Write a protein that binds this ligand. Sequence first.
Ligand SMILES: [Mg+2]
Ligand SMILES: [Mg+2]
Ligand SMILES: [Mg+2]
Ligand SMILES: [Mg+2]
Ligand SMILES: [Mg+2]
Ligand SMILES: [Mg+2]
Ligand SMILES: [Mg+2]
Ligand SMILES: [Mg+2]
Ligand SMILES: [Mg+2]
Ligand SMILES: [Mg+2]
Ligand SMILES: [Mg+2]
Ligand SMILES: [Mg+2]
Ligand SMILES: [Mg+2]
Ligand SMILES: [Mg+2]
Ligand SMILES: [Mg+2]
Ligand SMILES: [Mg+2]
Ligand SMILES: [Mg+2]
Ligand SMILES: [Mg+2]
Lengths: 205, 50, 273, 164, 156
Amino acid sequence: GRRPARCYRQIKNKPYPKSRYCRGVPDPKIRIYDVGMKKKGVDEFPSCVHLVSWEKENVSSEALEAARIACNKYMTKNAGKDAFHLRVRVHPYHVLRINKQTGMRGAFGKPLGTCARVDIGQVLLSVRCKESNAVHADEALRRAKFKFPGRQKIIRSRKWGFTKFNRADYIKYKSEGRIVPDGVNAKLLGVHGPIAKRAPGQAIL
Amino acid sequence: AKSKNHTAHNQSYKAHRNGIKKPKRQRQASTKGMDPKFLRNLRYSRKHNV
Amino acid sequence: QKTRAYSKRFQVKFKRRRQGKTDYRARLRLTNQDKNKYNTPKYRFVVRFTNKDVTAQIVYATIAGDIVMAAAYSHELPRYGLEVGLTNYAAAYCTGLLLARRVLKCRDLDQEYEGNVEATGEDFSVEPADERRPFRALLDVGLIRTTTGNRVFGALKGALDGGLDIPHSDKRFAGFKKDEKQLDAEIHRKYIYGGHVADYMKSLADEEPEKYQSHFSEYIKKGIEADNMEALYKKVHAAIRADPTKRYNPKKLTYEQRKASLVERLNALNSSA
Amino acid sequence: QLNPMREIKVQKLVLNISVGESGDRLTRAAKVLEQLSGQSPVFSKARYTVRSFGIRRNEKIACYVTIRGEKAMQLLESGLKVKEYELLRRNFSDTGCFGFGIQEHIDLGMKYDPSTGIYGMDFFVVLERAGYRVSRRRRCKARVGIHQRVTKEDAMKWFQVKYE
Amino acid sequence: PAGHGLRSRTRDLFARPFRKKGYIPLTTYLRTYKVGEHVDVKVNGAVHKGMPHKFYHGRTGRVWNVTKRAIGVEINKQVGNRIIKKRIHVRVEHVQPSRCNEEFLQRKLNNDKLKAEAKVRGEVISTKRQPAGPKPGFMVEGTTIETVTPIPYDVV
RNA sequence: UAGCUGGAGCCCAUUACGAGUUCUAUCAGGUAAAGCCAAUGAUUAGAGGCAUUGGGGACGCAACGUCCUCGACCUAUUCUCAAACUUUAAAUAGGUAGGAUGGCGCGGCUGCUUCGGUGAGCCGUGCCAUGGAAUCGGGUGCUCCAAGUGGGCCAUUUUUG
RNA sequence: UCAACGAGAACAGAAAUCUCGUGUGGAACAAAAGGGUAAAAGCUCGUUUGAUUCUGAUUUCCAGUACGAAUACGAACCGUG
RNA sequence: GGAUGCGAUCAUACCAGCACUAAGGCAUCGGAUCCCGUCAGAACUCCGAAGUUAAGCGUGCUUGGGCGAGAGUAGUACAAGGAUGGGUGACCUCUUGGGAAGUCCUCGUGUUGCAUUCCC
RNA sequence: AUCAGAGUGGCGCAGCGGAAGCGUGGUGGGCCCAUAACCCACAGGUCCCAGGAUCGAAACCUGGCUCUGAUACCA
Ligand SMILES: [Mg+2]
Ligand SMILES: [Mg+2]
Ligand SMILES: [Mg+2]
Ligand SMILES: [Mg+2]
Ligand SMILES: [Mg+2]
Ligand SMILES: [Mg+2]
Ligand SMILES: [Mg+2]
Ligand SMILES: [Mg+2]
Ligand SMILES: [Mg+2]
Ligand SMILES: [Mg+2]
Ligand SMILES: [Mg+2]
Ligand SMILES: [Mg+2]
Ligand SMILES: [Mg+2]
Ligand SMILES: [Mg+2]
Ligand SMILES: [Mg+2]
Ligand SMILES: [Mg+2]
Ligand SMILES: [Mg+2]
Ligand SMILES: [Mg+2]
């Protein structure tokens, strides 16, 4: 069916996204990017581990779909459905073309499928869990990385959950009560805005 | 057999091997094309110098 | 209310538009001198009417800003003789005459360009006869609708009657016959010498005595009946042609008190509730 | 503040009859306003040719006039003398104004003096305080500050405390 | 023609800059030109008359003939193996006077002043700029000297 | 036919003047990068309130009422993006100037210009101006007659199918 | 002053007409796309015929040829204000 | 410390929400005979001063939005020239030079000309 | 594989922007002992799915689909 990924492994062409010009593309393999309990708040799953891609390439939509489900089946069977949140951190926006008596006369091809362009040191997947339960995710990402063409690491990230705040700083800011907990995110507070819009106990310089 | 060909390859070399000939800058620069309202006056004064 | 992207993409217009005071499409066209004249500015005859004055100026355009050489107001007419009714058609006539006389006296060509010694409505242009061309100005109404009868065009008539050259035509002088397409000498004469207030003073005085008193108080208390308007304007025009010559707002409170007051509001809000 | 410049006062009444029709029918809807005002309505042509309402585009459907001053007050009190001086506490619009509608002849004015049918009509008045010429004049126009904008409490507490 | 009309390839060359759209400030009209000044041709998007071709946006040349609403500029276009002094008339909205010779014309007087001052005294001087060369020696009053060592690699 | 080339010369030349270069000053840029927590377009997920009723249960004897409900919507966020998207915005490359082809005085012309010796320019004359960054060096400086060529190919880098 | 949005008004509702507010242009400018514009280049009205005459210049293409188109003067005659 | 007219620079000048102002000036305002204007004296035009600072105008305030400046982001991203440089290649390093941008943090919120005029 | 064609009432087809019909079928009556046939009336449709312009679409054009027909050669 679909061509080998070696044909569409290197970036050789400028990005060719769906628009008022690239139309007739099919919808990509992947339609869901966040799986597991995506409703849990910041304080529940602190530990976060990412599958990071280490070579510039085109990970196909089919690959980046099959990888998440291979990272989900393991996590579900072992550590239960209520202890991980998976997020695929890349979207298939590049549209691959295929060209198929008549030779290369009129050689521009009709669109084939859709793939996501990655780069050196680009986070590709993330799982968030509880440190007591982190080993399962550590192995699940390793079990999913044999679905991608290049080299990847399985790197725990120094920050807290999916938030821009390190573990140390976020715990400092929780004890200082200078952070709004939003759900999966959090927001620092500070010295800008109107004094009015702040809650009575949430005023800082 | 593709009769359509195009390069600028070697054209900078042909241009520069005999210099990019700048025109000799001139005392008494040319007036052709200038504003006829200005030039009629300019001529008429030189008609009536002493 | 207006969102952040609105503010960030907003382009402000020119200050003298956000105040709604200038028409830049007119201004470019009035000030723009041909580039083969190189400096000779186009002097604009700028007349403006407030509710209680008739300002007039001769101004030219400079990079630094417009530079005035003769300013003539209606509130300097009392020094000449007109004490009441200083923003009417004839008052703007007098103000135009005064400004033209003063430009002439400042550039010293009045004696060769005296204009009409006496006002008339029949349209006036000067002979540029010999060696001295008249001072040439460009009238600038501003935002007013140039309808027939406008005080601006009374001021135009006065500026000409002083001797200035301002390109013009009689299609907006008061009393133009918009049907028949010529002026009436007598009706423009009436407007210039204040007939149009004189007949309304008589009209109120005949069958409206209470509005006459509530409506022309200053005319009353300066004792000027509708009977004495023309000759009054004769004398004021003669005077014009003969003699053309601590803290209450608060300081911006500075950073130290600002920062102290801020922590005070902060402690109030935080400690409370 | 109790500054007597801030006296609420009807800027204008506006009378609108839109018939969705044309020809002689609207020419009579012109008269039903011509008698009321003494000044000639201006027609309001349609737009958008929305068929389900039976109107082409650019064809005269409506007919309106603006009345202001003594005549507007005189005819406005008759307009509410229709309603028995009572509105819906919602006909007041949030900015400065309120409106209502009637069937003509429960006003005054003889009925078939042209032989024209009973046309209902749109009354709509926007109150003003003195000095909206600052938002209407051509030179130096600008908003009016909150302290001198009629609001809903201003229109309501104009309607119920006085004028009646 | 021949595949490309006058205002081709100018999706961004001829645009106004961001938040500088709309009106023409009066100074672009009250800056006056004289035959011989060096001016910069930069097209203005909103004024469509007298416009110069997209080649001339961002060049400099000497005014060579000045007329009402229009400046004659004379600039060098390089074609083949030769320089053609092209002569264009651009409406004044498209030209700004250059500050290339600002330093030159200041320094000309700054020089002739010193040649006068040298004629005053011993009449020897040399009015030339020299590019920044060797800096002479000097002592350094020994201060606290900060030792910096290459950082150990934290992978994170 | 233009380009590249030769031959015939000629014209001057170490004062000049020019440069496939740098320097100083000053213009122009929308490519890489970045951006979406900025407009356009795409796009993943939540958090909070909130609708004069997007549709329902249940209380609604009632409404100019609400708890759940798929959720519009607004608010502040979040993942990923653009050759035919951009606020911002490089590097290399582009243009111009760096004096003797400059200025100032005097007294003249104009049929242009100005309210006007007012300007614009030119004209005659007299004065100045240590050569006006570095380096380098005879020049296509001017012209004539004419040849062959007009199938290209490889490489490092940018790049389209 | 446009698109749109908020609130209101007999029949009238999502949408007919009216009124107020906000409205950086999210509308329109005959057509394709791009650029440009808010007392306008858009909408309505007024008067109109410069969509005229003579011959050059210049740009764009470029061999610095023609044509097409465009620009800036000149000498007329005019329109509008 | 003010104002008006004409302004140059066009957000440090805008936007939103507040509080306040001596004199003058501005404005608001009163009328519709005239010239003039429309459906409408609301607007535009002509005439005029009986009041009001209520709006406008002006000034100031906000841990405001925007804007402008700076520090950091960061010698990072990129990038000119060089390597019989590394690696299997994508790419990456070194050598001679240039060098950005968002979020985050701190500050600021107009300058000014000509003419006339008011203060205390 | 490209190039065309047609998609409209239950069926097969009309249709030139104001915008829905032809023949036949469906419905209720009438003639008939009864059914046809015939006579009189009655209801019709997502104008193939998603757009755009356009006073104004079902038609103009563009994307998404199904059936049908064409030209597919020198080695
Ligand atoms: Mg060839
Ligand atoms: Mg005008
Ligand atoms: Mg070409
Ligand atoms: Mg051709
Ligand atoms: Mg050809
Ligand atoms: Mg640009
Ligand atoms: Mg044109
Ligand atoms: Mg040849
Ligand atoms: Mg480009
Ligand atoms: Mg890029
Ligand atoms: Mg976007
Ligand atoms: Mg950026
Ligand atoms: Mg280039
Ligand atoms: Mg340069
Ligand atoms: Mg040609
Ligand atoms: Mg080498
Ligand atoms: Mg039957
Ligand atoms: Mg039967």
